[PDB]
């Protein structure tokens, strides 16, 4: 309801959130995942990413 | 953690100073009406103006007048 409740957060760390946790630390944006690498590391096998070499 | 600062002065949301039958409009006869101040030009009648020292503003359109009355 108040007017000034928002800095321009178009870009950088503060804008780019993750899909899962809502974190600004170790964020995979590669191939547009938008996932903090630790949740990715949990679900990687689910999302098609397998350890081969 | 480190200790908090404590200047002193705190500011709370105003309670507004509510009032009812408040206190515009009149009737002399009984049947007909005699409106005080004026109604809004922009929106329909029923909404009234705010009378100050040569400055007006409405409520339904937050604060949008300029001309005197």
């Amino acid at each position: 309801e108040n007017v000034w409740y928002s800095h321009p957060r178009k870009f950088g760390k503060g804008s780019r959130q993750c899909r899962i946790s809502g974190s600004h630390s170790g964020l995979i944006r590669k191939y547009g995942l938008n996932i903090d690498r630790q949740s990715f590391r949990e679900k990687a096998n689910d999302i098609g990413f397998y350890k081969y070499r | 953690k480190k200790v908090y600062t404590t200047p002193k002065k705190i500011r709370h949301k105003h309670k507004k100073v509510k009032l009812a039958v408040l206190n515009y409009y009149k009737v002399d006869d009984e049947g007909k009406v005699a409106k005080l101040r004026k109604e809004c030009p922009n929106c329909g009648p029923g909404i009234f103006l705010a009378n100050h020292g040569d400055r007006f503003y409405c409520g339904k359109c937050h604060s949008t007048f300029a001309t005197q009355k």
């Binding site: 309801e1 409740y5 928002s6 959130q17 899909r19 899962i20 809502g22 | -």
Partner: protein, 96 residues
């Protein structure tokens, strides 16, 4: 909680057509998808519901999920009106 009551009625109405609601975990958002209110106000409304009976809540992947229970359907009918044989997602519309 301090909601202009017109915006709240729209959210209830929009809830009852769907029988379902997919809200983000995104406060400070100017307007919600589909409904013409802030996302935060929809989440406050669906927070207010969950407490007094109703409304089965999840919080996975920054998306809240709210389905209306049997008593949830009864109270949304009480708020709006619509008496009986109505939309939600308890039963199908025709053949789908």
């Amino acid at each position: 909680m301090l909601i202009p009551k017109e915006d709240r009625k729209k959210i209830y109405q929009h809830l009852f057509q769907e029988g379902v609601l997919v809200a983000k975990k995104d406060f400070n958002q100017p307007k919600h998808e589909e409904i013409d209110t802030k996302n935060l106000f929809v989440i406050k409304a669906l927070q207010s519901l969950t407490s007094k009976g109703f409304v089965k809540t999840q919080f996975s992947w920054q998306y809240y999920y709210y389905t209306l229970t049997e008593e949830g359907v009864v109270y949304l009918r009480e708020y709006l009106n619509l008496p009986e044989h109505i939309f939600p997602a308890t039963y199908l519309a025709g053949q789908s």
